[PDB]
Amino acid sequence: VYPVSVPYSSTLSLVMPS
Amino acid sequence: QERPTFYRQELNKTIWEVPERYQNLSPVGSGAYGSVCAAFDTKTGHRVAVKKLSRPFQSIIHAKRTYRELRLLKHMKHENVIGLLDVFTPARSLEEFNDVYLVTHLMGADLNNIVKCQKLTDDHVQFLIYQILRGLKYIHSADIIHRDLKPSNLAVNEDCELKILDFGLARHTDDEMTGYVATRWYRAPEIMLNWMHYNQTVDIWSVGCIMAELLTGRTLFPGTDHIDQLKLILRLVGTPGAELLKKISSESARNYIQSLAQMPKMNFANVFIGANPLAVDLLEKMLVLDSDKRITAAQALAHAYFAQYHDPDDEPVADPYDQSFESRDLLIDEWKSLTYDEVISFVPPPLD
Ligand SMILES: Nc1nccc(-c2c(-c3ccc(F)cc3)ncn2C2CCNCC2)n1
């Protein structure tokens, strides 16, 4: 079983690591 | 115009000699057979990644590898595939030609970084995989097979945009700095042992492995050897028929699987708990042992998981790409000379 990070329910950014 | 003014400095223990237009050089790690520095470009006003090849003409194998990367990079013109803003050398003639620098737009990270420092929503996954597939369509249209898609070869920025790089060879290796340990985890069963029977469908497997990992934050098949790798796979997709089991495995591996009891296919909705059922459904069409039954890059773009982004008009294809040179057996100075012709012939994108 692999439970997802953020459960689905009924503009996108990414944080750069440094 | 004519030749720019160069300046010199020491980064990663070697002289970097670059046009003055590139400033504030900062090392951002290794690339394939070279290493990469972030910079500011005073010409275009963008931040750029500059990769210096590391002794590109030291041997035949390397000289040919250098040619192969430049040719390829020159050809890739697509939003989701690394291409060239610039390529330069400080030499003024072929006789003093030893070093090759390659410049592209600066991407902040790759998916390895992302997956190891934050959780992704389903929206994040939708767009990220949408981009991988879109580029993959382009790459496959040119009769090119990537072979080595994995998180570290997918570069990303803060806006969640994505570009595919570092195309791999149809070759198995355990050499230094080739990424061989992680490549095994994303590699299609049919090419885990040899490169005799395969096609472009190998990349879609890879994509499936990557998608799952973006959803869960964990590597889906993190095997320790080829036997353990095949086990881990079959445990999910079910033991296959005997004809197919033999296409995708070695004598020893096959014997190990048979010394275990038949494994049933798992319902992917019970593995990936909390997943968007559209996400699961697509995974179910990527991760299949029968490569023919595997959904293609083209088709997957039309899947309902990407309803929010799909647009058949802005998902372009490529001019097929001429790989004949690959058949020639040349000398270092011979490859190095073709590499020079390509440096000189290079035309940059327009300034927009
Ligand atoms: N920061 C950044 N931005 C874009 C690409 C790279 C880059 C290059 C590279 C390639 C061609 C080129 F022309 C200039 C740079 N090669 C590997 N990588 C990174 C891609 C994955 N992260 C580590 C290596 N790095």
Furnish the topology, listing elements before pairings:
The complex is a heterodimer of chains A (18) and B (352).
Chain A: no helix or strand
Chain B: E1 6-11, E2 14-19, E3 22-31, E4 34-41, E5 47-53, H1 60-75, E6 86-88, E7 101-105, E8 109-110, H2 111-115, H3 122-141, E9 154-156, E10 162-164, H4 180-183, H5 202-216, H6 226-237, H7 242-247, H8 251-259, H9 268-271, H10 277-286, H11 297-301, H12 332-344
Antiparallel strand pairs in B: 1-2, 3-4, 4-5, 5-7, 6-7, 8-9, 9-10
The structure holds the ligand Nc1nccc(-c2c(-c3ccc(F)cc3)ncn2C2CCNCC2)n1.
The ligand Nc1nccc(-c2c(-c3ccc(F)cc3)ncn2C2CCNCC2)n1 is lined by residues 28-29, 31, 36, 38, 49, 51, 82, 102-104, 106-107, 110, 152, 155, 165 of chain B.
PDB class: transferase
Keywords: Structural Genomics, Structural Genomics Consortium, mapk, autophosphorylation, transferase
Assembly: dimeric
| Helix/strand/pairing category of chain B | alpha+beta
**Oligomerization state:** heterodimer
Radius of gyration of chain B: 22 Å
Q: Please identify which CATH superfamily of the largest domain in chain B we are dealing with.
A: Transferase(Phosphotransferase) domain 1
Helix content of chain B: 25-40%
Shape assignment of chain B: globular
Give the strand order of the largest sheet of chain B, numbering strands 1, 2, ... along the chain. 3-4-5-7-6
Q: What's the level 1 CATH class of the largest domain in chain B?
A: Mainly Alpha
**Tally of helical segments of chain B:** 12
Ligands, deduplicated: the ligand Nc1nccc(-c2c(-c3ccc(F)cc3)ncn2C2CCNCC2)n1
* Percentage of residues assigned to helices of chain A: under 10%
CATH architecture of the largest domain in chain B: Orthogonal Bundle
Give the percentage of residues in beta strands of chain A: under 5%
Q: Tell me the distance between the termini of chain A.
A: 32 Å
CATH fold-level label of the largest domain in chain B: Transferase(Phosphotransferase), domain 1
